[PDB]
Amino acid sequence: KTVITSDKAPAAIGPYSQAIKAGNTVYMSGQIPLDPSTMELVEGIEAQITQVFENLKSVAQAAGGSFKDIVKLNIFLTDLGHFAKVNEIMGSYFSQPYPARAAIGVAALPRGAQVEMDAILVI
Amino acid sequence: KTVITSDKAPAAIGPYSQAIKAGNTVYMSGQIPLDPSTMELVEGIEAQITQVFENLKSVAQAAGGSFKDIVKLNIFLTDLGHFAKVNEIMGSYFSQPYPARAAIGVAALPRGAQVEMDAILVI
Amino acid sequence: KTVITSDKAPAAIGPYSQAIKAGNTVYMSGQIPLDPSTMELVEGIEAQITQVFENLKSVAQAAGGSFKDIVKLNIFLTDLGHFAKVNEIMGSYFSQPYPARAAIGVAALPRGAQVEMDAILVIE
Ligand SMILES: OC[C@H]1O[C@@H](O)[C@H](O)[C@@H](O)[C@@H]1O
Ligand SMILES: OC[C@H]1O[C@@H](O)[C@H](O)[C@@H](O)[C@@H]1O
Ligand SMILES: OC[C@H]1O[C@@H](O)[C@H](O)[C@@H](O)[C@@H]1O
DSSP states (O other): OEEEOOTTSOOOOSSOOSEEEETTEEEEEEEOSBOTTTOSBOSSHHHHHHHHHHHHHHHHHHTTOOGGGEEEEEEEESOGGGHHHHHHHHTTTOOSSOOEEEEEEOSBOGGGOSEEEEEEEEO | OEEEOOSSSOOOOSSOOSEEEETTEEEEEEEOSEETTTTEEOSSHHHHHHHHHHHHHHHHHHTTOOGGGEEEEEEEESOGGGHHHHHHHHHHHOOSSOOEEEEEEOSBOGGGOSEEEEEEEEO | OEEEOOTTSOOOOSSOOSEEEETTEEEEEEEOSEETTTTEEOOSHHHHHHHHHHHHHHHHHHTTOOGGGEEEEEEEESOGGGHHHHHHHHHHHOOSSOOEEEEEEOSBOGGGOSEEEEEEEEOO
């Protein structure tokens, strides 16, 4: 069991870790659109989707892996009208074989975020 | 690592796989009430719930397993006033030992779906 | 594979088990704020958060583990204004290394619960 932590990803203040590695499996925390250096949400849905992917990418790298190792991705959106935009931006972060995934429209997200995503990595 | 694809489940169009098998653990994508041949949602809640289970069943069979191997299932409903019905129909697809599960009321689901479910299977 | 059942956790009514242990990994069902003895929800947000943690703890103990073995926790709240209180109460139930977690605002929860949480445990 390993705590995965990178200062390239937003600081984890509170009782949780950016990710926990257990055996070959890395359980990554939900990432919201926080700019790590300012700890404020970036403005705009495309920038927020992109920031969540950058944050998850930073954690995956700290775990000695990459998006190629992601087996499952959960997508949480306050507005599913933006789901096609998530699909589009993913083309810039993923390629075959793609992760399994779930996507739901939620009522609200921490800090007023429009998008949050978590994932499971298998090294 | 292995990509799981059932030609009986709805086609995965876009950046995801129906399921990803990593060792003995199969991470299955969320399934919505899509009729695989028409790629349109079936009508009415009972039909939708049933279609989701049928879709997950196809993916489970493609993974070389069955509902008996599912260890966790997530239920996403736009209206929990439909929970009695998900429970009833679920009882008809699973038997002891029953899987672990979570259930939440969401604001919305892809394509205006009334229900979405994902699962984890262990061979 | 093993069914985990704690008689200190709310009875599982329906087609589910409180938790399933497969190998070294335990997949735990979402717990809501039910008082196991009355099957009624405890009242007040702090009590509800505490009861869900107590319910997961009971289930974790029956799986041969504890909160130290939790690698991922999912928090579902109908009102995220209650997130700070979840954080505070959670700090009393966990110690470093802390688990990974996700937290979302949902439209509704079973039985009118204000909070629900599920978790994954990896036993040594
Ligand atoms: O507000 C920051 C929060 O964002 C969530 O996505 C993180 O995963 C939580 O653990 C954290 O408390
Ligand atoms: O609209 C179809 C969508 O439904 C979800 O349940 C699938 O698993 C997603 O990967 C897919 O994009
Ligand atoms: O009302 C109790 C319900 O609470 C959920 O969080 C459990 O995980 C469900 O399986 C159960 O039906």
